Design an enzyme around this catalytic site. Structure first.
Site, PDB file in Angstrom:
ATOM      1  N   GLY B  13      47.779  43.458  41.613  1.00 19.56           N
ATOM      2  CA  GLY B  13      47.923  44.764  42.215  1.00 19.56           C
ATOM      3  C   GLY B  13      47.292  45.919  41.352  1.00 19.56           C
ATOM      4  CB  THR B  14      45.136  48.486  41.796  1.00 16.12           C
ATOM      5  OG1 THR B  14      46.337  49.017  41.693  1.00 16.12           O
ATOM      6  CG2 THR B  14      44.505  48.340  43.122  1.00 16.12           C
ATOM      7  N   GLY B  16      47.342  45.379  36.842  1.00 18.96           N
ATOM      8  CA  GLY B  16      47.348  44.077  36.180  1.00 18.96           C
ATOM      9  C   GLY B  16      47.247  42.954  36.937  1.00 18.96           C
ATOM     10  CB  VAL B  17      47.972  39.238  35.904  1.00 15.55           C
ATOM     11  CG1 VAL B  17      48.151  38.067  36.587  1.00 15.55           C
ATOM     12  CG2 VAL B  17      46.288  39.492  35.222  1.00 15.55           C
ATOM     13  CE  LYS B  33      51.356  46.768  39.407  1.00 15.83           C
ATOM     14  NZ  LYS B  33      52.492  46.891  40.443  1.00 15.83           N
ATOM     15  CG  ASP B 128      45.686  53.513  45.450  1.00 14.76           C
ATOM     16  OD1 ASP B 128      45.186  53.613  46.823  1.00 14.76           O
ATOM     17  OD2 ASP B 128      45.800  52.608  44.932  1.00 14.76           O
TER      18      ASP B 128
END
Lengths: 70, 285
Positions: B13-14, B16-17, B33, B128
């Site tokens: 999700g933009t 992190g992993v 995250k 965002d």
């Protein structure tokens, strides 16, 4: 390879835009718009009288084209 | 990670992993995250963490509470409550020919408005905002995720979903932006909840602008003061009249359309606020 938008229009012109591969936009003139010869050389394929009419500075690989109606 | 077992990977999700995990004390299921921080200079203290510290405070039922924050060797773990559904996912799951029950739309929008008003309210933006950020629980509650994370930080088609929910202030290269961007996004989302389709479905920044204009009219200074001064405004834009919005969207009473129209006013000073929107006739049920 090059992406070509559907067409759209005003009452005054018709329009479309063309997305070039990134690579090539190094070599799109930044301070002027292109003649027909100029854009054909980049490999753009379209009928006559489409005019390169503006630049969106943050997307310089997107050529914007416009042609008058009746 | 002392307190948490990694159960499994669940995306990127933009930031992190993203991982699934469990709290070893409380058994709580969590979303984690994992974020690798840019090494920092000697004196320069990190504003990124300062921000995150502050975001940890925020509790509200319609936002995804950021439960904990942790520090390993220069990496940062954001611990959130685990939700298995999001709105993008939901909308996709609707069979063709059916639509989202218009009273559930209304429910959802209100809840979304409440979460943003809360955030706004607390000096905090989303920026965002978009359907994959709006999570849902089994209880039918909807929650904003990733509020203020943009601020705390800063490849390219990763950007080009994000494009559909993006305000024309930002698109035209406006010097500053504020809470009106989140309302714009929420307007675009509102339309989608009704129709199942993205409202302004552009392929590029410039095509996104053009899509918006074809529906709302090409802006000038009459309708949006100082607009023609923006860095990426041009007088060469195609010239569409307004627009003709019911045209672009079905399953809303006149109230819905009106509220919506007010969420998509060009001029950000004139665009509806989160609070006002919560008083619109639309919400009477």
């Amino acid at each position: 390879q090059i992406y070509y938008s559907d067409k759209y229009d005003d009452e005054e012109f018709e329009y479309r835009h063309v997305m070039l591969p990134k690579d090539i936009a190094k070599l799109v003139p930044k301070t002027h718009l292109m003649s027909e010869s100029e854009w054909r050389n980049l490999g753009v394929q379209q009928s006559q009288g489409w005019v390169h009419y503006m630049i969106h500075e943050p997307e310089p690989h997107i050529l914007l084209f416009r042609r008058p109606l009746p | 990670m002392e307190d948490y077992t990694k159960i499994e990977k669940i995306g990127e999700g933009t930031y992190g992993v993203v991982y699934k995990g469990r709290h070893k004390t409380t058994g709580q299921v969590v979303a984690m995250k994992k974020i690798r921080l840019e090494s920092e200079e000697e004196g320069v203290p990190s504003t990124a963490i300062r921000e995150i510290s502050l975001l940890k405070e925020l509790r509200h039922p319609n936002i995804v509470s950021l439960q904990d924050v942790l520090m390993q060797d220069s990496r940062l773990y954001l611990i959130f409550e685990f939700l298995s559904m999001d709105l993008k996912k939901y909308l996709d799951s609707i069979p063709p020919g059916q639509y989202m029950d218009s009273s559930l739309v209304k429910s959802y929008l209100y809840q979304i408005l409440q979460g943003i008003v809360f955030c706004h309210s607390r000096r905090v933006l989303h920026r965002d905002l978009k359907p994959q950020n709006l999570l849902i629980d089994d209880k039918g509650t909807i929650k904003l995720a990733d509020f203020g994370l943009a601020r705390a930080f800063g490849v390219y088609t990763h950007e080009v979903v994000t494009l559909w929910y993006r305000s024309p202030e930002v698109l035209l290269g406006s010097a500053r932006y504020s809470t009106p961007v989140d309302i714009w996004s929420i307007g675009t989302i509102f339309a989608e909840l009704a129709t199942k389709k993205p409202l302004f479905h552009g392929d590029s920044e410039i095509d996104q602008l053009f899509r918006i204009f074809r529906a709302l009219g090409t802006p000038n200074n009459e309708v949006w003061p100082e607009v023609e001064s923006l860095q990426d405004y041009k007088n060469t834009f195609p010239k569409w009249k307004p627009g003709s919005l019911a045209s672009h969207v079905k399953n809303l009473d006149e109230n819905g359309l009106d509220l919506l129209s007010k969420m998509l006013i060009y001029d950000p000073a004139k665009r509806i606020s989160g609070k006002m929107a919560l008083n619109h006739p639309y919400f009477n049920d």
